[PDB]
Amino acid sequence: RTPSLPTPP
Amino acid sequence: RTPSLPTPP
Amino acid sequence: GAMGSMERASLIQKAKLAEQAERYEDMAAFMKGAVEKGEELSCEERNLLSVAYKNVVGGQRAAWRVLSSIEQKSNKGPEVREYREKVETELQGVCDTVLGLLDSHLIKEAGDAESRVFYLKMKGDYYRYLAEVATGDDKKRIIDSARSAYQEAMDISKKEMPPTNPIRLGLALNFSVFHYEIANSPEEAISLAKTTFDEAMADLHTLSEDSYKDSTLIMQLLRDNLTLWT
Amino acid sequence: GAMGSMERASLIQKAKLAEQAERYEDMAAFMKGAVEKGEELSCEERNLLSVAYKNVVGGQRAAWRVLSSIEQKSNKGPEVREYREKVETELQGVCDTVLGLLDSHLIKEAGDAESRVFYLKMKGDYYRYLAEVATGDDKKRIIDSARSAYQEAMDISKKEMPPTNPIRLGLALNFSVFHYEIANSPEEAISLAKTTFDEAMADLHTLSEDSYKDSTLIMQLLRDNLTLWT
Ligand SMILES: *Cc1ccc(-n2ccnc2-c2ccc(CC)cc2)cc1Br
Ligand SMILES: *Cc1ccc(-n2ccnc2-c2ccc(CC)cc2)cc1Br
């Protein structure tokens, strides 16, 4: 599936 | 700590 | 709840410890406890809530996809279906818990654009996760629940936040993924990502170095999706 | 137990699915259910049991070490200690569960050298994990429990298994780590690893290609530890 927003840095 | 046995391949 | 006897500050402290220890189920339980104290969450606390549940549901979704793929290839006995259903039910439970926190009473008490958008984005995301596994009479209503939450978040963000705001950008990213992956609307997905990227690019000149870093990180993820989709 | 109504074969099937899905807590619960059916475990099933619990306790140990380090640096309120204690108790519970399966009744029914050594090695390992977090009146007894299990396993393995047998090699590796990390006996650790390595090297000529691969993988881990320790 397309990547959604990851964890913030 | 020193490495012990890992998971088998 | 089990966290009712622990101080709010101690729950927040332990959530941060749980994050360092990569104990995300514990982190989520601590943050649920903190929400249930009834006070609004700060920016940092909202991020802790989000990280905790994203990690928990992330693992569940990854497991669900593995099992669903095995099940699809099987189409042997009922075990694959049963275990996929077990994971699915647990995932649904976590989503319902998050949605319940948002509804009781995080969203209604959220008056500032930053908080309200953050929570409505979360609401869209967790309905999206429910949509990923939905079949039968309510799937359309689940999809529309996600859409509605995202759309309200988008409307507020466009009026109240700069085009480089990380929450605004993250919302756009996730709503575009909703369009592509859930709503069968790839053109809408692409158009949203492109317009978001371009409007952010035009506003970068206003930012400090640290704000620039955050905005450009998310812009690059928009670009990555555009590359994948085109 | 909660798995009492599920067929043994279905528990084994689901343990394999859980492994593919990286759902190790589920995997362990399925394998506990399978053990509690009362029948001996096959080679493959023993390995499933081991993988499941190794992953579960591995996560707990990693979290414990993170928290213990924060606690050490703190020496603020009781929260770090409390949360370290929470993780510690959960770890101890998992170790006690594994030890309980071994004692009721895996070890006593294990007559073949391969099975008996495997289980006694496990018993040493889980007492070792208890030793890692132990303080107060019983720490010496925990350490001796680990030692005793490992020593019985070593005695059987030396009599009944070739020096290249993977279980024999893995036992030696872990017992040497016990010596170095728990028993304050680095010289014994080094001597065990060296003699194990050398006796395995001398027997490699007897092996097929596939057996050679497995034995040499573990020999390289012995060598790696020797390099770290010298
Ligand atoms: C949905 C969302 C959007 C932005 C953030 N966020 C707050 C502060 N920094 C960020 C952020 C998140 C992701 C990335 C890409 C790696 C950069 C910056 C948090 C959330 Br939950
Ligand atoms: C304790 C132990 C020892 C050996 C195995 N094992 C069985 C079959 N192959 C292996 C094995 C395990 C580890 C490695 C190093 C990567 C190689 C081969 C299983 C256990 Br639980």
Side-chain angles (χ1 to χ4, degrees):
Chain A
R1 281 216 187 244
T2 307
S4 61
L5 191 75
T7 300
Chain B
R1 281 216 187 244
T2 307
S4 61
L5 191 75
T7 300
Chain C
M3 300 299 174
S5 62
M6 203 183 306
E7 289 282 13
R8 189 183 189 282
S10 300
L11 290 163
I12 298 304
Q13 186 177 172
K14 292 182 183 179
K16 294 172 186 177
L17 292 172
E19 188 183 22
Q20 291 180 82
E22 295 179 72
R23 293 272 292 196
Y24 296 106
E25 293 180 23
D26 290 349
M27 193 185 178
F30 295 139
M31 291 309 302
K32 174 173 190 296
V35 169
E36 292 173 350
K37 297 299 175 183
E39 301 277 10
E40 296 186 23
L41 305 186
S42 69
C43 181
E44 183 177 1
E45 294 163 354
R46 288 191 298 269
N47 282 285
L48 291 167
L49 180 67
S50 176
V51 166
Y53 278 108
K54 272 189 177 162
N55 274 275
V56 172
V57 78
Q60 294 174 319
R61 292 164 66 208
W64 185 95
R65 293 184 298 258
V66 164
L67 299 170
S68 185
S69 175
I70 294 166
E71 188 179 15
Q72 284 166 312
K73 292 189 181 70
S74 81
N75 300 320
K76 209 167 64 196
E79 293 82 1
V80 173
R81 177 188 53 78
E82 289 169 351
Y83 185 46
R84 188 269 297 156
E85 287 171 355
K86 181 191 175 168
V87 174
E88 185 173 298
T89 300
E90 293 180 10
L91 181 165
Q92 287 168 330
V94 170
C95 293
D96 289 346
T97 290
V98 170
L99 292 168
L101 296 173
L102 294 172
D103 201 46
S104 299
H105 294 94
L106 291 169
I107 291 171
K108 67 174 57 60
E109 295 292 351
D112 291 354
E114 290 66 29
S115 59
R116 196 168 183 78
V117 173
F118 189 100
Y119 294 134
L120 289 165
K121 178 188 169 186
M122 288 190 55
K123 184 175 182 174
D125 286 343
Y126 284 85
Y127 274 116
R128 171 160 61 81
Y129 306 152
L130 289 175
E132 286 178 342
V133 305
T135 68
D137 290 359
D138 59 354
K139 179 184 164 66
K140 286 169 179 181
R141 265 177 291 267
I142 293 168
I143 292 177
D144 204 64
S145 289
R147 183 200 62 65
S148 183
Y150 285 133
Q151 188 62 61
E152 187 180 349
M154 287 287 313
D155 294 343
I156 299 163
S157 72
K158 284 188 274 176
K159 183 181 169 63
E160 301 293 349
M161 290 169 153
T164 48
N165 177 279
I167 307 308
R168 178 165 173 183
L169 290 176
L171 167 62
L173 177 76
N174 284 4
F175 193 22
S176 74
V177 165
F178 169 85
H179 288 306
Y180 195 87
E181 294 286 352
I182 307 298
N184 197 31
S185 300
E187 291 176 334
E188 188 69 15
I190 291 163
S191 294
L192 177 56
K194 182 73 154 43
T195 59
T196 303
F197 181 98
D198 289 344
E199 286 162 32
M201 176 71 56
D203 189 58
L204 288 176
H205 75 274
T206 69
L207 300 182
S208 71
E209 180 167 312
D210 292 355
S211 296
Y212 180 92
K213 191 188 169 274
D214 286 339
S215 299
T216 58
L217 284 172
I218 304 169
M219 290 171 64
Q220 182 62 52
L221 301 174
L222 288 163
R223 175 57 60 200
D224 289 344
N225 289 353
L226 283 163
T227 298
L228 188 67
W229 295 341
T230 68
Chain D
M3 300 299 174
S5 62
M6 203 183 306
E7 289 282 13
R8 189 183 189 282
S10 300
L11 290 163
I12 298 304
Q13 186 177 172
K14 292 182 183 179
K16 294 172 186 177
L17 292 172
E19 188 183 22
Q20 291 180 82
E22 295 179 72
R23 293 272 292 196
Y24 296 106
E25 293 180 23
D26 290 349
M27 193 185 178
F30 295 139
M31 291 309 302
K32 174 173 190 296
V35 169
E36 292 173 350
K37 297 299 175 183
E39 301 277 10
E40 296 186 23
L41 305 186
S42 69
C43 181
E44 183 177 1
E45 294 163 354
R46 288 191 298 269
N47 282 285
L48 291 167
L49 180 67
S50 176
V51 166
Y53 278 108
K54 272 189 177 162
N55 274 275
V56 172
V57 78
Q60 294 174 319
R61 292 164 66 208
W64 185 95
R65 293 184 298 258
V66 164
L67 299 170
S68 185
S69 175
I70 294 166
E71 188 179 15
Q72 284 166 312
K73 292 189 181 70
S74 81
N75 300 320
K76 209 167 64 196
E79 293 82 1
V80 173
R81 177 188 53 78
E82 289 169 351
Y83 185 46
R84 188 269 297 156
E85 287 171 355
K86 181 191 175 168
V87 174
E88 185 173 298
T89 300
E90 293 180 10
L91 181 165
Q92 287 168 330
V94 170
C95 293
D96 289 346
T97 290
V98 170
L99 292 168
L101 296 173
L102 294 172
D103 201 46
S104 299
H105 294 94
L106 291 169
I107 291 171
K108 67 174 57 60
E109 295 292 351
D112 291 354
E114 290 66 29
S115 59
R116 196 168 183 78
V117 173
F118 189 100
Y119 294 134
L120 289 165
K121 178 188 169 186
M122 288 190 55
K123 184 175 182 174
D125 286 343
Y126 284 85
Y127 274 116
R128 171 160 61 81
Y129 306 152
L130 289 175
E132 286 178 342
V133 305
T135 68
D137 290 359
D138 59 354
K139 179 184 164 66
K140 286 169 179 181
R141 265 177 291 267
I142 293 168
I143 292 177
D144 204 64
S145 289
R147 183 200 62 65
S148 183
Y150 285 133
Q151 188 62 61
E152 187 180 349
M154 287 287 313
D155 294 343
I156 299 163
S157 72
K158 284 188 274 176
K159 183 181 169 63
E160 301 293 349
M161 290 169 153
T164 48
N165 177 279
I167 307 308
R168 178 165 173 183
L169 290 176
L171 167 62
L173 177 76
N174 284 4
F175 193 22
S176 74
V177 165
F178 169 85
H179 288 306
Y180 195 87
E181 294 286 352
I182 307 298
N184 197 31
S185 300
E187 291 176 334
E188 188 69 15
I190 291 163
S191 294
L192 177 56
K194 182 73 154 43
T195 59
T196 303
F197 181 98
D198 289 344
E199 286 162 32
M201 176 71 56
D203 189 58
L204 288 176
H205 75 274
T206 69
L207 300 182
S208 71
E209 180 167 312
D210 292 355
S211 296
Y212 180 92
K213 191 188 169 274
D214 286 339
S215 299
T216 58
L217 284 172
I218 304 169
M219 290 171 64
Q220 182 62 52
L221 301 174
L222 288 163
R223 175 57 60 200
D224 289 344
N225 289 353
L226 283 163
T227 298
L228 188 67
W229 295 341
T230 68

Short mmCIF file of all heavy atoms in Angstrom, two decimals, chain B:
data_model
loop_
_atom_site.label_atom_id
_atom_site.label_comp_id
_atom_site.label_asym_id
_atom_site.label_seq_id
_atom_site.Cartn_x
_atom_site.Cartn_y
_atom_site.Cartn_z
N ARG B 1 25.54 -6.36 26.55
CA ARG B 1 25.85 -7.70 27.01
C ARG B 1 26.32 -8.55 25.83
O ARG B 1 26.04 -8.24 24.68
CB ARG B 1 24.63 -8.35 27.69
CG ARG B 1 24.35 -7.89 29.17
CD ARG B 1 23.82 -9.04 30.04
NE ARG B 1 23.38 -8.66 31.38
CZ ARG B 1 23.94 -9.07 32.51
NH1 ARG B 1 25.23 -9.35 32.58
NH2 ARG B 1 23.20 -9.14 33.62
N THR B 2 27.06 -9.63 26.13
CA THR B 2 27.49 -10.55 25.09
C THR B 2 26.31 -11.21 24.37
O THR B 2 25.38 -11.67 24.99
CB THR B 2 28.36 -11.67 25.66
OG1 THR B 2 29.45 -11.12 26.40
CG2 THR B 2 28.89 -12.59 24.54
N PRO B 3 26.34 -11.34 23.02
CA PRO B 3 25.30 -12.10 22.34
C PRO B 3 25.19 -13.60 22.65
O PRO B 3 26.16 -14.36 22.59
CB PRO B 3 25.60 -11.82 20.84
CG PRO B 3 26.55 -10.60 20.82
CD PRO B 3 27.30 -10.67 22.12
N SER B 4 23.97 -14.02 23.00
CA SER B 4 23.62 -15.43 23.10
C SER B 4 23.08 -15.95 21.77
O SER B 4 23.13 -15.26 20.76
CB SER B 4 22.62 -15.62 24.20
OG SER B 4 21.46 -14.84 23.86
N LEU B 5 22.61 -17.20 21.75
CA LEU B 5 22.16 -17.76 20.49
C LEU B 5 20.96 -17.00 19.96
O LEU B 5 19.98 -16.80 20.68
CB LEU B 5 21.80 -19.24 20.62
CG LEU B 5 21.58 -19.94 19.31
CD1 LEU B 5 22.88 -20.20 18.63
CD2 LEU B 5 20.87 -21.20 19.52
N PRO B 6 20.99 -16.56 18.68
CA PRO B 6 19.83 -15.95 18.04
C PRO B 6 18.82 -17.00 17.56
O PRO B 6 19.10 -18.20 17.61
CB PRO B 6 20.45 -15.22 16.84
CG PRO B 6 21.59 -15.97 16.47
CD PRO B 6 22.14 -16.58 17.77
N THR B 7 17.70 -16.52 17.03
CA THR B 7 16.75 -17.33 16.27
C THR B 7 17.42 -18.16 15.19
O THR B 7 18.30 -17.64 14.50
CB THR B 7 15.75 -16.43 15.50
OG1 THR B 7 15.03 -15.62 16.41
CG2 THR B 7 14.77 -17.23 14.65
N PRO B 8 17.01 -19.42 14.95
CA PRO B 8 17.54 -20.19 13.82
C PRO B 8 17.20 -19.56 12.47
O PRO B 8 16.18 -18.90 12.33
CB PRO B 8 16.86 -21.55 13.96
CG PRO B 8 16.45 -21.64 15.43
CD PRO B 8 16.09 -20.21 15.79
N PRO B 9 18.03 -19.78 11.42
CA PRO B 9 17.76 -19.23 10.09
C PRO B 9 16.41 -19.74 9.57
O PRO B 9 16.01 -20.83 9.96
CB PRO B 9 18.95 -19.71 9.25
CG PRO B 9 19.51 -20.92 10.00
CD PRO B 9 19.26 -20.61 11.45
#
